[PDB]
A and B are shown apart, each in its own frame.
Chain A
Amino acid sequence: DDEEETYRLWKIRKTIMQLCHDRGYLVTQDELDQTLEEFKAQFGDKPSEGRPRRTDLTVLVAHNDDPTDQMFVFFPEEPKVGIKTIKVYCQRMQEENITRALIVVQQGMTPSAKQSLVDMAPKYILEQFLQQELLINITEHELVPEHVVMTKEEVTELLARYKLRENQLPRIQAGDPVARYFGIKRGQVVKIIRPSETAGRYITYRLVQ
């Protein structure tokens, strides 16, 4: 259904743009709260069987701290994603000289293509995201607390005050939807400011491993 696709694609774009803002990238104010009515107007046509496709849905953002740390959000535009298309995207990203990119994969992914994300060079950072996962913003959920990524400077200071080690802190899986949402890797500490019923506010730090 063409009408259903408009809402499905609109939610992905809205969540994707908010993903960069939560990560720490500079995002335009209008693109975060962009309305569905403006989704069709700014494309000018229906996505399915029309000029608006997933290829042009790609967005470019720059990190707030430094503009040279741009981010990519590519869309395969295909029922299944293979190795050949993946090699093209990173090869295309090579010209722009960018280090991180996001792929919004459809419900189906080739198992061989999954290995592309593992054998990539350390400077390559490709994160896979299912279409269903991005249709909803996990962060805004009431159960999910506020997650803040801790910089390296804070982590060293944090352990010094509490005299803690990396293993002593609570662990969090790298494949967690929240961890994937923030695009965090091993060795990163996430600050969780949850609204504790007893003390009102309780800050918890979890190490990705």
Chain B
Amino acid sequence: DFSARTVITPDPNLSIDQVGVPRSIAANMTFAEIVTPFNIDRLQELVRRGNSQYPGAKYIIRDNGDRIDLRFHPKPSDLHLQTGYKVERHMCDGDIVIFNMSMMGHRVRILPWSTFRLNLSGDEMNLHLPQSLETRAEIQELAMVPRMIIVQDTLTAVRKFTKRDVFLERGEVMNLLMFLSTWDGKVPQPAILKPRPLWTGKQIFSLIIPGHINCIRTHSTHPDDEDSGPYKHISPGDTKVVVENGELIMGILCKKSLGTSAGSLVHISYLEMGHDITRLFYSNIQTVINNWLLIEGHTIGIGDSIADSKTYQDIQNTIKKAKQDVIEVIEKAHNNELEPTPGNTLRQTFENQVNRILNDARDKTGSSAQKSLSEYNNFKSMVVSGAKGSKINISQVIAVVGQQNVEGKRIPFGFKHRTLPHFIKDDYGPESRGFVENSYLAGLTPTEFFFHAMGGREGLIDTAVKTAETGYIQRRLIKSMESVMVKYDATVRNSINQVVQLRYGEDGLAGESVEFQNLATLKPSNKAFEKKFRFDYTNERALRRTLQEDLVKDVLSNAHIQNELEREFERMREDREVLRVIFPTGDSKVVLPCNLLRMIWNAQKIFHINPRLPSDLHPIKVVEGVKELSKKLVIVNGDDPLSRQAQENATLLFNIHLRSTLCSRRMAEEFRLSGEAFDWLLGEIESKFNQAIAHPGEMVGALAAQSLGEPATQMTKNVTLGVPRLKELINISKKPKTPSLTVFLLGQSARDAERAKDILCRLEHTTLRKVTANTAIYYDPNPQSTVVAEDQEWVNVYYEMPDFDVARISPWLLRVELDRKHMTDRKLTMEQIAEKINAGFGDDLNCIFNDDNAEKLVLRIRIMNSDENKMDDDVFLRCIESNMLTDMTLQGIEQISKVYMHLPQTDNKKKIIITEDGEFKALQEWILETDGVSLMRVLSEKDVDPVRTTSNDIVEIFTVLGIEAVRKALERELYHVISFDGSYVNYRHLALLCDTMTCRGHLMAITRHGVNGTGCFDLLLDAEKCKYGMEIP
């Protein structure tokens, strides 16, 4: 029953799940309901109301299937209904509706006005009503908003609300607590009892936090040195967020702490409590903050944009300094003083230097503007909380708009060498080329306005096409993975029943319950790891402090316990080695199902564990308990060796992290958990992991497409990225835009710069055109003539030897000069060039080279004597001349235009090698990024790493390394573009896309059709269980 579309308006009072609908729309919509004795009267009254009154029924269906219209009401008897009938009663409060392939269900609430109401936390929409009860029950159980998951108007006020300055009087506190649904009914004790009660904002928000959840976060304006300083726990600026037993003890909340992220209050509550409790957390925050906002209030005005005169002078001074610096750079290029970089040309180098000066000025002036804003300033409040806007937006409003780049470059010369008629010809100044030195508040000059429009026009065009392209990818991905689903054997299979993945995400765990954490058994070196993990029972005094007197005696009484303690450490050390190969990059961050660190903290608070007193937990219990827990956690159930081997692989990281986090030393050194606390901890881990198992019947393929398509909208040496690369990755097209290849060097040359140049030259393809200066065809009657005067001195001595002079020689010549500068860069030699010409072309012609020490290099080429004795020699020389200047490769590999060599500052490119001490260290190794794909030949080159040398073109990798290597390469390219803008996507979703494409053994283009189901189990009735039961009537 599709409804009429209507505009959308916000409604903070309504819950996020609830949706507001007008009476008129609900009147047209009908919901068929089966009448039952328990609600026979309810249908009897509603049908009596009629269609004129809103709470009525459009039609009534009898058992035989006949539909009777209630508009007419011909007979009272026909109005009367019997049990088992179906009545199409009009939609009322409490009904479930579904609208925007993943759709979220909502609970309809009737409101007077016409426009729809949605508690966002505009565009028209049509809400669909599920008529059947079965799907209605299913929708409310899995498709509700709480299971699917804050406005910017609340996050900004939340940051102000949690500020230590905020103090609430008794009267104000009453109103805030009234809107709190999850309130125990008891007013908390004021923080400041005298001289007058004053509740802090955190105290009110403490009740908002549900249950007891512990998490540590940091405010956006958190100085780095503050954590290292002595005031780390007592934050001078309240920039550290800590929650204990569900109480916000300290810290100002913001998007980082309260907004959705890897670690946040909402995220922690979702895992700790669930979805239903989390929704109340959202509702309480929105309602309570809104009421308080009426007291504090949020606004914006000119005063925010008007900065102090001191900063204005600095901004203008920086702008003036930048403008003068640009002129100086222009003057240097005017007088030829500027020297181009070896990796760029003069024209491009000048554009780079000027861009940095202007770009740096905007950032420096913009940064000063951020510091200029006071705490009371409204502009600072928005950015500080991170709700809306950005530091760049304030910079363009206060300090400077910045350069207006068009098509990735400055304003082009639309006219003859001048951007606009007003500017002089061939003007490369700031104003002429579009540099906007005036902020929005100050006002732009007439020239700047047009340049600003040109920059804005490009963004609008890009935005218009970005949505069209990005939307196309979303539909294409869903179709190719619509049938992908997890079956009851914990395997991922499509409609054809082909195994895409043995286990979902290669682990068999859901992507929602997993939480980010960093196991600390790989980063520490061979000195810190042993001290922090290996239990030391030799120190009598230390054990007494850590363990009670009886425990110390027990461990030192029998050697059986001592052996187990050392054995547990050996397993951890063994786990340390396997992690290194698994994580060559050495990053500690990893995705795991349940967070042990948070769970341990919860146990400490639940049982009130204090580190002062000795821990009564037996260390042998930790190792024994962990051993039992590992067996209980099962991914591949079975007893066959394949299942046992798969089980270890599936839980390889979890067991390693579990043992490292839960060990004898840590449990008695820092965690200090008691015996009872550990027992509860083991049970919680087992329950959390069991709930983390991928439930069969989940459309992981559809989930992955949505998870991969959402970041695609926020996407948009020169390496193409964003939508253009994303299209080319799914579009297997043989010829990408910029198919670059990264070359990694090894050995001594990998460190030196000059030693890496020869590799650069031997990889880059150079032709005679790039090394030649000029060429001409001169005439010499006799061999000894040499009409050219300059070369007569050196040709004579060389020609004395009768080489190829046994017979007549044609009087033609093909003398060609070689550029001196180009030869030095390539380190070429005259003999090398001559050898290729003779060997490459054969014995058709003979070449003569001069001394290298000569300032000008002369290369004389004449047709071979044998061929001399139809283009005999004159026209042929013209033909051959063009050939050797176009398709002649003195040294290099074809399809390689240029090679970019530069030391990589990024850690990923840098080689990471385990040091002798143990701590990870990243050395500096030169990397040569080259345009084009020649992986087959580039890899088979001297002083080139055959392992780490990888290309960005999947097609090239397929023909060289195979389909299996493409799966990893495709993952890297997909992750590289997704992570370029800072967005992150779960690896399981990315792996699924690559596996499906490579499932058939060859690269498959994503289904271009892009047109765009719980049937793996059937419910069966049992007579034995039906023997018991009494009918309600």
Contact = CB atoms under 8 A, between A and B. Distances in A.
A161 B490 CA distance: 13
A152 to B, nearest CB: 15
A177 B960 contact: yes
Interface residues of A, number: 47
B964 A192 contact: yes
B836 to A, nearest CB: 12
A6 B318 CA distance: 62
B586 interface: no
A142 to B, nearest CB: 5
Contacts of A145: 964, 968
Interface in B476-522: 489, 491, 493, 497-500, 502-503, 505-507, 509
A203 interface: yes
B1019 interface: no
Interface string A117-143: 000000000000000110111101111
A177 B962 CA distance: 6
A192 B493 CA distance: 19
A157 B640 CA distance: 10
Given A7-B942, A197-B987, A203-B649, A171 B961 contact: no
Given A132-B936, A136-B940, A143 B988 contact: no
A71 B690 CA distance: 51
A195 B968 CA distance: 11
B946 A171 contact: no
Given A141-B961, A172-B1001, A209-B1001, A200 B937 contact: no
A204 interface: yes
Contacts of A179: 962
Sorting the interface of chain B by its residue count into under 10, 10 to 19, 20 to 34 or 35 or more gives 35 or more
Contact of A178 (B500, B964, B968, B988): B964
Given A168-B497, A198-B507, A206-B1001, A137 B946 contact: yes
B645 interface: yes
B498 A167 contact: yes
Nearest to B645: A203
Contact of B652 (A171, A176, A200): A200
A201 B963 contact: no
A200 B506 CA distance: 9
A133 B939 CA distance: 10
Given A161-B642, A170-B499, A202 B653 contact: no
B660 to A, nearest CB: 13
Given A143-B957, A178-B962, A201 B947 contact: no
Nearest to B507: A199
A161 B645 CA distance: 12
A198 B642 contact: no
B649 A162 contact: no
B911 to A, nearest CB: 12
A140 B947 contact: yes
A144 B962 contact: yes
B962 A138 contact: yes
A29 interface: no
Interface stretch (B204-212, B329-337, B992-1000): B992-1000
B938 to A, nearest CB: 10
Interface string B622-646: 0000000000000000101011011
A84 interface: no
A158 B489 CA distance: 14
Contact of A172 (B498, B503, B963): B963
A143 B961 contact: yes
A173 interface: yes
A55 interface: no
Interface string A171-209: 111001111000000000000101111111111111001
B581 interface: yes
A161 B640 contact: yes
Interface in A2-54: 7, 11
Q: Which of B581, B590, B947 has the most chain A CB atoms closer than 10 A to its own CB?
A: B947
B940 A135 contact: yes
A174 to B, nearest CB: 9
A164 interface: yes
B999 A171 contact: yes
B143 to A, nearest CB: 27
Contact of B1001 (A157, A162, A173, A198): A173
27 contacts: A133-B936, A136-B940, A137-B946, A141-B946, A143-B950, A143-B968, A145-B964, A158-B642, A162-B489, A162-B491, A168-B493, A168-B498, A170-B498, A171-B1000, A171-B1001, A172-B1001, A173-B1002, A177-B959, A197-B987, A198-B987, A199-B505, A199-B507, A200-B652, A200-B656, A202-B649, A203-B502, A203-B645
Interface of A: 7, 11, 132-133, 135-138, 140-145, 147, 157-158, 161-164, 167-173, 176-179, 192, 194-206, 209
Given A157-B640, A173-B1001, 15 more contacts: A132-B937, A132-B940, A158-B642, A161-B640, A164-B499, A168-B497, A172-B1001, A176-B1001, A177-B959, A197-B987, A198-B987, A198-B991, A199-B505, A201-B582, A202-B506
